Design a protein around this ligand. Structure first.
Ligand code: 6CR
Ligand code: 6CR
Ligand code: 6CR
Ligand code: 6CR
Ligand code: 6CR
Ligand code: 6CR
Ligand code: CL
Ligand code: CL
Ligand code: CL
Ligand code: CL
Ligand code: CL
Ligand code: CL
Lengths: 232, 232, 232, 232, 232, 232
């Protein structure tokens, strides 16, 4: 019904989790939700709806980069009237004080995408998490004792950047680099919806060290748990 | 000892409240604090130290605009090793859903100042409140039932702007316009300190309606109360 | 072996066709090539190698937008030493003189992506097709009588753009809008490889008219045919 | 009557001297003028009117930085119909050929403020002194033998600038750095008024040497003398 | 009849060759064309019409830099309805693989001129050669065995550039630097005309070596020959 | 000896007048100077040396636009050690208060050229006339009663500008539009030389009215007279 999502009216829940990898969308749905339906296979960018403790929850792959997620966020909001949009992904830590097991909640994101300069010109637009979701996610992490850090991230257009400024960004307190948050937070606010990015650490970019498969399995699972207690 | 602040080592507290108007600095000190000393009269930009429930607290006028507050924030951090910097001021609401009695906590701020473009060039740097202070301020407002809203603001260089984009900013969910937050949050993060702006409503810019003297007296006083419970 | 592509040394051919949709990668491989192997399933972003008239040819999904294709182009070049990179996709025509059955060969592309401003600053970098591939593709279209048009396209970051300048772009002779070419041509030239985008018409953006399923099936097939005669 | 200035119709003279420090406004009024009245105490940003050789002259503190002076200049022009606006302040010399006792007359100023980029976009707007005032000020300096230099200055947003380009500016002949002139000259020309900045040397920025208290007392006094003979 | 060209209706041919130097315009006309008339002497910027193998052909000096050629291109198009515009000039090679005897055909050009940023703002506009002329010129070079290279060039505003980025441009595959192509290709496309730049090598900029008088005489003559077989 | 000027050491005087049109260079030399020699015919961009009241004076065509004059100014300064550079040209008046017979002295110029953004990035560089020459030229106009106006001009890259902002420029007090001053003043200051542009009115751009041949003959002649009394 919308150009990129093959779902009919009603198949998509009010609350959508937004991994980048459509195979993580599948994984998440199969593993966390009951009564799972796949409402979309267009471009292999899987989307699913199921229930979690009796409440409908969709999970939708976004792809990588601002332009890709923008497509999905726009259609979810405009065509399916989605209300709560929660990115669940990873980022490369760019400070030593950001630990491999920390679950990051982005208040805001910096970017080298031109998307906001296209709309505002000489204004630096700072995108903003919905506080209600942020606080809930934070409270849920605390209540369970999941280590959680709250700050900003950098939304990059180039995974491989020869002109990378992450070193300067780190000195300004920025926590990590990823490629979607700016778009999510900007598009959700523009349409009066609620958005939050929750992120795990894929690696430390300035030391090059990977997080281990085990560490990744655990922070991933913590991230999903926190996500599922962020609405209300 | 520092170019713009006539204080000696030790006169300035770890925690500084940052009104714009140096006469509000005076007012605040005289009204809220015990054992008040004025440590600075340079340029009439008054700064004071006193105690509040047994703890030293300074209050320092910043002046108006990014360049003015930047001067004071930099010297407080670099010369006096100040740790917690809390702007207490007002802003013009730019949305109807922001009410005349709301106390605003800025997660972040947009800007038309070039300060961050000078440092980063093709990066939109999004400044970030320290979450710890934000959360405390929020908790203190809640515990007392002070109405509080948490979102972003716009830091403007021009009070009188013929090319004002506040209308587009409002559609993106931005709450109000003021002239200091971007600088405060950027400079504090750059040096590893903690910053928060707490703001009341001076008026609704897109309707032109002033907030009354009574409304102003009350939200002002609420703002100070919340500020004094934001550290720890 | 490379972060985003699960292939081992040698599985990927010298020449790679680059659809956006990984399901079109599959379709193309199954339909056009003999002895097909799938060398990648990471993120569902399928990549395949097979033969066409005795020569190895890979087909690799890129995803949507500059940041997504940049990832794949960079890894194909740097990790697998790929030599010829040919985008095969569609674009929305933005001029009436660009006909629904035309196969477009992009000499160059305009963009609102910041990727090149990040590297060059005050330079407008104009990306360039490899002429050798362009000419071959052109010759192959001509020899068969496939209608073909040679000009520029616009690489957009935002599919849904409220600040879209396509109308001005059309007056300057630009043929259509898509979301990958700038990245492909910039990254290939930077590493001394050969790149070409060949595009069909998904619709006319300024009239809103879709191209029919039949038209799409035919120009698609023409596009693949032209692609398979572009190397040498 | 105007938001930032507590004066009634008529209290403010046609000609206003514009120090940054409101305590220098006081000093100047008390020391140079007869029959002095203070028409403004709002924010401690003192403004005064008195007479000098029988003619009314006001002196008004501007604060520091483009945003602060812009507020005062705009209200003086729009609310009080002020005609002649003369900045009297200091600047840090950035060339050795600019001597500690030179009184600078700014023909124009460069800037890293975005104020003009906000209004003009891709135009570098060069602000311009009113020549009539400049020439008078120059003639008065010459007639008395006050050493005077006529050139450009740099209006900076950041007193403490990690990305300071003053070294390149100095090679282009720029004389010194301050924080108000661009705003003064731009706002005055926009409304058909006459503006001039007259500046003394606070220090040499690229050698770090302060000007002595004695030197400062003398060039200050010369600056005021020249200012008082610039109208007509 | 047009501000800068003293020609009457009809004196200027459909096809105009565009050297920079008006003395090369003369040279070309006298040497290559029969029945030569000079239709313009305004500013010494000579323009001529003659015939070549029975067809009228004009040759018009453009001067140096985007602003100068823009004047001539605009008047030729708007006042004299010129259809085919072919720059014939030189450029400084910026890569070793571009040989002193190569005749360059510019598909496109990069630039540090602001002309396109003035019109498009946050869009990098990539100007495009008319393919029909390019292909003809290419075919004519091939048929005769004239060595020919097809790629991009850089249109510079500053012959003497202290901030020259040609080194980065060379790594991205850019062939050489000149000062007109961007304007020619942008203005011709904007008005639906056909444009091509054909260029010889004046020198290698990154090695400093001049091309010899003999080399220059030969590539020049090859360039004219190719130009005269580019229409149709 | 320099790439664009065919003169030998010593042929060029300390003081050079800089018309745009090389035929006006000729005219000026033949009409105003004794013992005239032509030292340059390269590109028809004539340059001449003669004497005026016993002092050597050169006159050198610059061509049109920042890139063209930049070439000539750079070579005159670097190769021939020229000290005083005086543009003598015209501009289109953009305000009614600028009269057809006024001789304009540019203190400074705005621009849409990127030349200064290329060197300074986020700085608006304001070019500055040499005051000594300006004052002399002014004094000479006054002593003779030649009407003279002193302010700023706009240096445009595009004579035919669809995105012309001259209307906004006029409201900010800018006097007229031309195409060279920014380059002259920037390049002269960068090398420690003295520069001035003196300009007559070619027309009123916002009313379209031409200045008559008679008016042009007279202001032209006044301009030359003022130029010849600007050194010392
Ligand atoms: N630039 C970047 N860098 C690092 Cl170290 C990342 N770790 C995870 N991501 C996320 O993974 C994808 C890129 O592999 C993007 O969706 C991005 O949001 C990362 N993106
Ligand atoms: N632009 C602007 N607009 C409105 Cl409606 C304001 N209300 C309060 N402020 C604060 O008041 C001062 C300006 O009067 C600035 O410090 C600013 O931060 C405001 N600033
Ligand atoms: N902006 C945009 N617009 C139109 Cl009308 C398109 N038609 C096809 N594409 C391609 O399709 C994807 C978006 O659906 C992108 O990969 C893009 O390159 C288009 N992209
Ligand atoms: N950046 C800067 N630098 C130096 Cl070395 C200065 N000397 C005086 N000022 C003026 O003093 C104030 C800053 O202390 C500003 O009003 C500014 O205009 C200076 N501003
Ligand atoms: N920047 C530049 N550099 C080099 Cl090495 C050149 N060789 C020839 N030209 C052409 O020659 C003139 C400059 O001499 C310009 O028209 C330009 O297009 C060159 N322009
Ligand atoms: N844009 C522009 N406009 C007007 Cl109304 C002009 N009148 C004279 N000139 C000068 O004349 C030449 C353009 O004809 C340029 O050298 C320019 O400096 C003008 N340039
Ligand atoms: Cl992710
Ligand atoms: Cl305030
Ligand atoms: Cl596609
Ligand atoms: Cl000052
Ligand atoms: Cl040339
Ligand atoms: Cl001229």
């Amino acid at each position: 019904m919308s150009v990129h999502i093959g779902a009919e009216k009603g198949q998509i829940a009010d609350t959508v989790l937004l991994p980048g990898d459509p195979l993580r969308a599948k994984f998440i749905a199969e593993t966390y939700l009951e009564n799972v339906e796949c409402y979309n296979e267009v471009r292999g960018m899987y989307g699913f709806t199921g229930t979690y403790k009796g409440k409908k929850i969709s999970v939708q792959g976004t792809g990588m980069g601002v332009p890709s997620i923008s497509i999905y966020v726009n259609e979810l909001i405009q065509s399916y009237d989605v209300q709560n949009l929660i990115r669940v992904g990873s980022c490369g830590a760019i400070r030593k004080d950001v630990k491999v097991r920390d679950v990051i909640l982005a208040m805001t994101s910096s970017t080298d995408s031109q998307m906001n300069r296209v709309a505002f010109g000489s204004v630096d637009f700072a995108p903003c998490a919905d506080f209600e979701l942020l606080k809930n996610a934070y409270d849920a992490a605390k209540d369970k004792g999941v280590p959680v850090t709250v700050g900003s991230v950098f939304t990059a257009d180039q995974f491989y950047n020869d002109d990378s400024q992450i070193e300067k960004l780190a000195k300004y307190g920025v926590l990590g680099v990823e490629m979607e948050t700016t778009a999510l937070y900007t598009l959700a606010a523009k349409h009066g919806r609620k958005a939050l990015s929750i992120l795990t650490v894929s690696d430390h970019v300035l030391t090059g060290e990977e997080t281990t498969a085990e560490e990744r399995q655990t922070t991933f699972h913590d991230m999903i748990d926190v996500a599922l207690h962020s609405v209300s």
